[PDB]
Design goal:
It is classed as membrane protein. Keywords: Respiratory complex, complex II soluble region, membrane protein. The assembly is dimeric. The complex is a heterodimer of chains A (604) and B (259). Chain A is an alpha/beta fold. Helix content of chain A is 32%, strand content 18%. Chain A has 15 helices and 26 strands. Chain B has two domains: 100 residues, Ubiquitin-like (UB roll) (Roll), CATH 3.10.20; 146 residues, Fumarate Reductase Iron-sulfur Protein, Chain B, domain 2 (Orthogonal Bundle). In chain B, helix 5 packs antiparallel against helix 6, helix 5 crosses helix 8 and helix 6 crosses helix 9. Chain B is elongated and about 65 Å long. The termini of chain B are far apart. Chains A and B meet through helix 3, helix 4 and helix 9 of A and helix 1 and helix 3 of B. The site of iron/sulfur cluster has 16 residues of chain B, from helix 5.
Chain lengths: 604, 259
Amino acid sequence: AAAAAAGYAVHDHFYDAVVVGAGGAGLRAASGLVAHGLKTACISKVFPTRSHTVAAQGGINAALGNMTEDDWRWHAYDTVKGSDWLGDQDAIEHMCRLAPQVVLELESYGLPFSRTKEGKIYQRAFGGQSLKFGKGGQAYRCAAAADRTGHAILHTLYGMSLKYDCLFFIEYFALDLIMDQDGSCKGVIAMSMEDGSIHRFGAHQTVIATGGYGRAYQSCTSAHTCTGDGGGMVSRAGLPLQDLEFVQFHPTGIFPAGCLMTEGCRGEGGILRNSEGEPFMARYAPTAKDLASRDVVSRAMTLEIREGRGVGPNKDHIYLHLDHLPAETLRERLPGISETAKIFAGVDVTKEPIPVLPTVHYNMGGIPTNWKAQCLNPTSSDPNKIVPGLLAAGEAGSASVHGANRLGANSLLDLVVFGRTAADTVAEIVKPNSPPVTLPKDAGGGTIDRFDKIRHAKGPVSTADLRSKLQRTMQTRAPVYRNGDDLKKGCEEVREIMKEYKDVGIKDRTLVWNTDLIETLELENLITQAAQTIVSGEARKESRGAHAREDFTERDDKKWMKHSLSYQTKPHVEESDIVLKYRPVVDQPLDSEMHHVPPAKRVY
Amino acid sequence: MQTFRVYRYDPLLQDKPHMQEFNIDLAQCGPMILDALIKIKATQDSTLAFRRSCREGICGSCAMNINGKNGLACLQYIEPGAAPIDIQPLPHTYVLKDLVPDLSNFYNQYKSIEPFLKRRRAKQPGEKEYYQSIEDREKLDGMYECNLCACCMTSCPSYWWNPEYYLGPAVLLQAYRWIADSRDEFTTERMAWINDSMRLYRCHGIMNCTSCCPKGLDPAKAIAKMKAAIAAAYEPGWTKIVAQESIANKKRESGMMYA
Ligand SMILES: *Cc1cc2c(cc1C)nc1c(=O)[nH]c(=O)nc-1n2C[C@H](O)[C@H](O)[C@H](O)COP(=O)(O)OP(=O)(O)OC[C@H]1O[C@@H](n2cnc3c(N)ncnc32)[C@H](O)[C@@H]1O
Ligand code: SF4
Ligand code: F3S
Ligand code: FES
Ligand SMILES: [K+]
């Protein structure tokens, strides 16, 4: 269409649903909505196949039972323990009970899974997975496709979206949400990086399927595109974000590249050794030495380097020895790791150890959501109150299936399950044919003004310099082992970086593929989420899952079994404060098919 | 102190594209080319535009032309020398800005081959995974790893000349991947559609696609196999088969499709 707001060409679209994101969660949600007969659009900054979901390597967890006898209820118990009793058991049951179906559906659309001798899907061992509610042994639930299980899923979900004919707006950077005065999302306001035009997508139900904000740290396994844009949009809408202090460091990341070595490497026989040549992981998490929870392994590795038993000339990292394993298994089951090591590390997996170090990988926090993927705006009386027209899925969302620590091969499962759930939930709300949404009168006004103010920004500090400052502070003030003093120092520093965004300046003033402007808009999202992370972490005076305070080294179930909600006071990052409130965790499973897993010790 | 000449075009000025030379200290830069480009953007000229996500070679977004040969900047190594390292956009592509190509035709052509599993019977209720042997899964080994970087595409002299008629190496390999997938049941339909003079037989075996592939795949070998299979399996009734499938797609939305 054609309008002119503040001198910008504004096009108007009026769909029944809009999905921001074309990663795993977004591609699944879109295909589902279209399959339900609803008119839908799917906005993405990159071609859907270039999303970070493609970089996944391990696999997706399902109680298929192809390798050993299995029950979904056992998978559910493992997830509760792994979450350190911070995840909702309602959402965990829904995800685990659907994991078999979701994985088979993906195979039905052509996902090239690895196969067994009977023609079934091969499943590999992963950390934190057991049988018989912990009384059994290692559980092989991770349906993998070689070392390329992400590439497979994302390509297959794109194919499914093509089969259903999903309307895609590729290379469109979403800026904000078109919120109503009452408090309901009425769509999104995006820009095209290829034409330079602003588009006001108006939908009855919006699905935020962006990724995480892992690029807010100096060393991450995340993509440069992982800036947490949907979280910033929600925060600038005045809505809460949850559990942002729980940032997962993956135990093995190539040193110092920051690339990821699949946990499947250890799940197929890989051993971590130190300067003394010891498989030290037996001392911590003895029953599952290297296949312990990712948070335990990372803390063990950090303590070992700290104790002086680190490998390398600088004694700064740890060694992962896959050399002892058969060369055929390495070539067949870990085909991608070998090449990446040969390049970014110069290591021959079959003959040499790989240098590794704990690196930020995933973010358990995100938009608060219920088990139906409806975003929540909790109130003192209604902790389960939901934003009327908003839903979330993927790493961006926090249904708290993963709680304080995510079990490997459960995120890709959350992408498919909750993307599907989000499509089902909208179907019930919005009918296949409905009168068009009434975009509010001043829809985008503020967003256009801010975009123009940032476009014509001529201040002293550069976006890159400010980003490096933030990345440094997060890496140094929120490491694997956090202390309260540093957390306070950092909280002051991030607040300064917040008020420094008012001095950022860009040199390019065009609108077609202006990476300078896009990256400055992304830095706003990165700053707000990174700020809420430090504030929430300093406020949590306990040690649960990935959050490991040296000052407080013990879980506090009595006073800290709560979800942590952060709020940005004002829409402008340089004019806002991070307020913290809390909401209770859902402990009762949604049906009786699964029982409540009582809070307990997490030894691994 | 390496010198890096980089192609520069402003979509608004629409001034003739030019190569600008930058000087970078390799001591304070990462080994890969993409690190040099990021450093240039961060320090010297922030206007520089380029696509980059994964940093590990898997997304397929950093495809460029470095010193003549296509490649992914994140996996390409800086090679110091007196000679400036010339970085340009993908060959014979419309440049949206600086090093950002226009690959919309490549995306459309891929949608044409309909890369999703097709079966005559819908999965019966109570059915598990469709059976595929390890040997059958082995057939799809070197074809399912394509990251759509589009280097092989923009290295084929036949895609340079007839971009809008020739599907190109990457799309053709993906078509063979779905013609070779034992689970797919529309083998004849796919072969009939691909059996066109412009779509397939514009490949003259230059082998630039296999030489530049960043993932070490062999699109040239796949196209040769697909041509041999079609020649042996051709029947007079293939044209009718294509027509019947076209009728089946009558109610599809507006976009590239089987027809
Ligand atoms: C980083 C990572 C994650 C990962 C993994 C390995 C790595 C290196 N391996 C995994 C594994 O083995 N098993 C598993 O269970 N999970 C694994 N993960 C986790 C998972 O891959 C990530 O959490 C993933 O990011 C989740 O997928 P999701 O669909 O939620 O997000 P995405 O893939 O990052 O893509 C998000 C999309 O949103 C678009 N976007 C972003 N900002 C915007 C704006 N502003 N406007 C519009 N669209 C936007 C992105 O472009 C992308 O398409
Ligand atoms: S065949 Fe190779 S060069 Fe072509 S798109 Fe696939 S990975 Fe890229
Ligand atoms: S270079 Fe081109 S002509 Fe064929 S062999 Fe490769 S696709
Ligand atoms: S940045 Fe992803 S392929 Fe290079
Ligand atoms: K077939």
